[PDB]
Design an enzyme around this catalytic site. Sequence first.
Site, PDB file in Angstrom:
ATOM      1  N   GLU A 164      53.558  71.190  76.391  1.00  0.00           N
ATOM      2  CA  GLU A 164      54.250  72.307  75.727  1.00  0.00           C
ATOM      3  C   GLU A 164      54.874  73.293  76.733  1.00  0.00           C
ATOM      4  OE1 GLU A 164      54.624  71.838  71.979  1.00  0.00           O
ATOM      5  OE2 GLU A 164      53.974  70.088  73.098  1.00  0.00           O
ATOM      6  N   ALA A 165      54.202  73.457  77.841  1.00  0.00           N
ATOM      7  CA  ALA A 165      54.680  74.185  79.015  1.00  0.00           C
ATOM      8  C   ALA A 165      55.941  73.552  79.602  1.00  0.00           C
ATOM      9  CB  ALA A 165      53.560  74.278  80.031  1.00  0.00           C
TER      10      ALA A 165
END
Lengths: 41, 206, 264
Positions: free
Chosen positions: B116-117
């Site tokens: 997600e980063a």
Amino acid sequence: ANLRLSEANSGTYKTFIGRVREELGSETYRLYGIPVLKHSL
Amino acid sequence: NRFYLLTLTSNQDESITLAIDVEDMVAVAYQPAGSHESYFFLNAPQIAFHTLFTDTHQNVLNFDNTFKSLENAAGTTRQTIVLGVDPLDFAISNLFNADPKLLPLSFLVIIQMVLEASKFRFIEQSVAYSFKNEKTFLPDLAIVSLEDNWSEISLQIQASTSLQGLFGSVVELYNSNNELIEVDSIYYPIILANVALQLYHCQVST
Amino acid sequence: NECLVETRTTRISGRDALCVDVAGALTSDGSRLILYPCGQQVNQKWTFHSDGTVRSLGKCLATNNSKFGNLVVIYDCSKLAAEDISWDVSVGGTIMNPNYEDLALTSNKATRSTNLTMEVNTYSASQGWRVGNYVQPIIGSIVGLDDMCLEATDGNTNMWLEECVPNQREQSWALYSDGTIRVDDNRELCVTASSSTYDNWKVITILNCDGSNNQRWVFLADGSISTPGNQRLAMDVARSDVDLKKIILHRPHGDLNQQWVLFY
Ligand SMILES: CC(=O)N[C@@H]1[C@@H](O)[C@H](O)[C@@H](CO)O[C@H]1O
């Protein structure tokens, strides 16, 4: 594409995320500058 | 080929190899280094079982890689699960030792802090702070709304090429004080400067 | 869910976060449009069509030097020439007609009720627009190298990187629809590229917002904070050295010292 947590600061974390993006994002297919995910590696 | 291997190594020098489907950018399976076992999500693609860790005995997990399934199995939401350096260390450890209690929680940590980063700068930067300051955080609506809308944002970006950068649909995102920001175009930095990878939907161009 | 969008109704916000407004909701051919405080009024609703027209009250936004001179107006899509009602929106906030290449949508004043015009494009903060239904300034921190935050220093007159302190007032910025980055605690003040130099590059400081082409910035997908249009330049931390207390305007190279994140 490795991540070691003993050798880990903000800088190495960002470098790692940077490499994941490199490898997963298309080199040629971008929209408004944002890479589309690659079709194959 | 389709599956991207990726290694994470703990402070105890226990390392695992995680496989990512490049099509969806989702985690499908993993193997602890020097082990005879591997572990596959219930909804891993067929090709995952066919090509990955054929060396090993392939175990199938009790949950799938959707956030709902993971939250259900962890017994808690992403809005209460701590992220940071020590959480990541704990998570890698718990995957390595295959601790059935803490598997779903550990996946939630790793997926957010890595995948997600990689998708969003805002999440990358939130995580980077936790490294620099050695201080854990819990995601609220700003992070969660990005995670939940990635596919939809990717679709709207592609759709926007057909009508002057305007979206076909409204996406509901939140800022750090939980204020709603309804986005209906590419002309917001929270989209254009944030989204670092997009899911393929359609064959379009700028 | 489909990758072709036919028509969309949204708002257009420009200078000083004001909206593009068809003057007094007038429906007549040649009714002129002005900048006005944003609201839900039908005359602030703009519908973009796949043909390239942009419309309010069922009529098309238009420009013609022979008929209207410098002034931008609504007019009938059937009556007007196809050249004069076609429009293009760019990621950098420029609204323009592809046929009238030198020109761009402008608001020569920051005050409300000012007639909108087609002036020469200098990529100025009076020529910067956000097409989208959320018209408000986006407030956050701006994070650069070493995870440090841009801070408004010297009584809101200079700008450089300091260690981030959550909820510090001087580290909060407001991004406006005109492409200005403004001091949160004083919205008359803009991040501006000065005449003062370092290594023959302009240093970035805080001045009064004047709608110039020194105060218009776009956050791009490469992570830069850049000037719109060609002959583009990026905001950068001089020599990748935070201790210099100098943010300068450099030729773009996408290295760490030119990478920023909006932390909203
Ligand atoms: C604010 C502004 O520019 N208003 C002018 C108005 O003073 C002028 O008399 C009118 C013609 O009736 O045209 C408007 O555009």
